[PDB]
């Protein structure tokens with residue numbers, strides 16, 4: 177049954193609903209827009225986006241650098257790019273901490289993330305809270321099936337800053353971050369968690385993704401038809417379970433809030449009377465990081 | 469396992 181649980185298709189609606197006794201189980205879906213404030217570029221933004229900033233790596237086209245088969249025949253563009261992009265400091269955003277607070281308030285069933293920056297773990301989400309849908313830069317493995325030597329971040333970082341292409345110390349096979357390059361299979365966990373999680377979901381909260389990457393994007397339509405969906409994004413996504421209907425005669429459960437993910441989270445914090453708690457969480461945790 | 473693609 178396509179029931180209605182939002183009183184109004186606004187963020188105040190979503191907040192009241194969040195305050196209802198029914199809303200106990202939240203899933204976050206996130207992408208690259210939630211980390212743009214931490215100085216990590218997204219792909220799709222103009223001038224700043226990565227797809228407008230690769231020309232100087234002499235690729236067949238921009239996308240190729242993140243393609244498993246191109247990376248295999250020529251891994252050098254990628255690792256030179258990794259050195260250009262490698263952050264001076266890994267400091268999660270407000271958006272990140274807004275999900276930490278959900279976890280703390282008992283409301284977070286799962287965060288499904290497309291990012292590889294590890295900011296979620298850093299912000300305090302345990303492994304069990306997370307499905308890293310495009311993998312992680314944190315660990316790396318050699319590509320030989322029969323070897324699969326793990327290597328640490330530091331080893332991988334050494335190599336990157338050295339401009340030495342990582343080779344397994346044992347078998348000499350190329351060493352790849354545990355990222356899921358385009359053309360790769362998504363991790364086992366993704367499909368298994370998606371089977372369990374979407375049958376308990378009271379609210380979908382979608383932030384800083386253009387929802388063009390599959391099969392992450394389709395997660396939206398795995399939600400029960402009655403489950404309200406909030407997007408917090410600069411631009412509307414999810415349109416082309418069913419895609420996001422925000423604005424037509426039939427709209428009943430979807431909201432778009434258009435602006436910065438940081439701004440959105442603070443606004444929702446505010447409606448819940450969370451603003452101070454969230455402000456204090458960011459500060460305490462930011463300083464703990466600066467303390468190292 | 470289905471596959472990362474644009």
Ligand SMILES: NC(=O)c1ccc[n+]([C@@H]2O[C@H](COP(=O)([O-])OP(=O)(O)OC[C@H]3O[C@@H](n4cnc5c(N)ncnc54)[C@H](O)[C@@H]3O)[C@@H](O)[C@H]2O)c1
Nearest residue numbers: 207208209212218219220290291292384385386410436437
């Ligand atoms: N941090 C990272 O791990 C990172 C960075 C860049 C790209 N990627 C990869 O890019 C792929 C594309 O997916 P995507 O949708 O995440 O990226 P995308 O570039 O396709 O879309 C990002 C979306 O975020 C929006 N946005 C950007 N900055 C924002 C902000 N500050 N506040 C609110 N919205 C903001 C953009 O308008 C866009 O709709 C993913 O597979 C991901 O692995 C990851």
Ligand SMILES: *C(=O)CCCCCCCCCCCCC
Nearest residue numbers: 242258261262310313356357358
């Ligand atoms: C999914 O879209 C696979 C491609 C992943 C894009 C990687 C972008 C990350 C750039 C930051 C440099 C790495 C430092 C952790």
Ligand SMILES: [Zn+2]
Nearest residue numbers: 318323344347
């Ligand atoms: Zn090896």
